[PDB]
Amino acid sequence: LSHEELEAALRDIGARYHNLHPFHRLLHDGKLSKDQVRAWALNRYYYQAMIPVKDAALLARLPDAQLRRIWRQRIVDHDGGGIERWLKLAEGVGFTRDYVLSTKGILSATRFSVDAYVHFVSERSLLEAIASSLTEMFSKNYDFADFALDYVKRHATTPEMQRAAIDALTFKCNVLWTQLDALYFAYVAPGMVPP
Amino acid sequence: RLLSHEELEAALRDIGARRYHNLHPFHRLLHDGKLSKDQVRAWALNRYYYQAMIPVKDAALLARLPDAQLRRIWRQRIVDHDGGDGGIERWLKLAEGVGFTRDYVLSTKGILSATRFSVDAYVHFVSERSLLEAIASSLTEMFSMLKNYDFKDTLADFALDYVKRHATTPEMQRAAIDALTFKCNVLWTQLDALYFAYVAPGMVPPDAW
């Protein structure tokens, strides 16, 4: 209920966050094939390629110029810049720039979980939309955010709002969690899926 | 790629020859009766969600329609599913009939995120794409049992017409062939999630009952 307990609860949900997912475990501890890392990169492009779609989706819902200016900074980071760093990693492990861009190869589950993220932000309430960035509280073995948290504290005024805040963060974690499930399903075990 | 028409029916049919959910490890396993009771439990729980959301889809779709004559045709699909007692209600029977409480199944607390998100994508697709695609995405219906699972009282042509007469540019024929692909993906990921979580191997935060 208070700002620090509210925060304590949001962090605890981190301690559900995607570094615990088995697809991260492997990756982080040097154990995935190169095709497996490529797949990862190919799919994770689409997640990155839509963060600015998401922040612009959210910007239009902001009620004053002051809040828009601030949020706009995140659009500026990715469109440039951020998306461009991501292309380079996937070019970095062998993909033509044009193949990554067109999304031909990405998995339907990624596409849905990411497009789920875009629509939450535009359908759910502003407090929830803002609360779902807060995974940003939580962010070399192959030869080959304080504004959001202030915001939710001052605007989650009631118990219900407060749980929406918490629910919204879990939604975020699920979005991310299920990208990874798909990628494990498709590419580490058992290993299936059409185009 | 040029124009088609009856060749177009055999392009649409042909997506179901491959991309339609009956050619899936989960659907093979269910059909042949090799899943445990719990695995028919997961499937049944998750599928409720797809079934509960088809009227939502068709409303969303009903709202984007340009006139009353069309809303009238399409309104039937809504009725089929909502009924006072109709299509969704059978599906709750199936869930009830493999041990679930009506209350848990209804709430969706325990569906997997991938189903939520695939089904939701279908809802948006129909709100966002052209009328021709929304309609085309119905066409798995051109492809619409369990005598290995001992567990009594628990035991379409308009669209295909619309698409041929309105798919007059090659760009529109692909869009509709994609629309049907898209939807094949929606069912396919539902099942990929189910396979991953309940058969080989996975688990998935709070979800599975």
UniProtKB/Swiss-Prot annotation, chain B:
Keyword Magnesium (UniProt): no
Reactions accelerated catalytically: 6-(2-amino-2-carboxyethyl)-7,8-dioxo-1,2,3,4,7,8-hexahydroquinoline-2,4-dicarboxylate + 3 O2 = pyrroloquinoline quinone + 2 H2O2 + 2 H2O + H(+)
Pathway per the UniProt entry: Cofactor biosynthesis; pyrroloquinoline quinone biosynthesis
Any one GO MF annotation of this record: quinone binding
Keywords: Oxidoreductase, PQQ biosynthesis
Keyword Acyltransferase: no
Family: In the N-terminal section; belongs to the PqqC family. In the C-terminal section; belongs to the PqqD family.
Species, as recorded: Methylorubrum extorquens (strain ATCC 14718 / DSM 1338 / JCM 2805 / NCIMB 9133 / AM1)
Main function: The PqqC region is involved in ring cyclization and eight-electron oxidation of 3a-(2-amino-2-carboxyethyl)-4,5-dioxo-4,5,6,7,8,9-hexahydroquinoline-7,9-dicarboxylic-acid to PQQ. The PqqD region functions as a PqqA binding domain and presents PqqA to PqqE.
Residue span of region PqqC: 1-209
EC numbers on record: 1.3.3.11
Encoding gene (name): pqqCD
Any single biological process term in GO: pyrroloquinoline quinone biosynthetic process
Lineage of the organism: Bacteria, Pseudomonadati, Pseudomonadota, Alphaproteobacteria, Hyphomicrobiales
Protein name, per record: Bifunctional coenzyme PQQ synthesis protein C/D
Enzyme class: oxidoreductase
Full-length numbering of the shown residues: 15 to 251 of 372
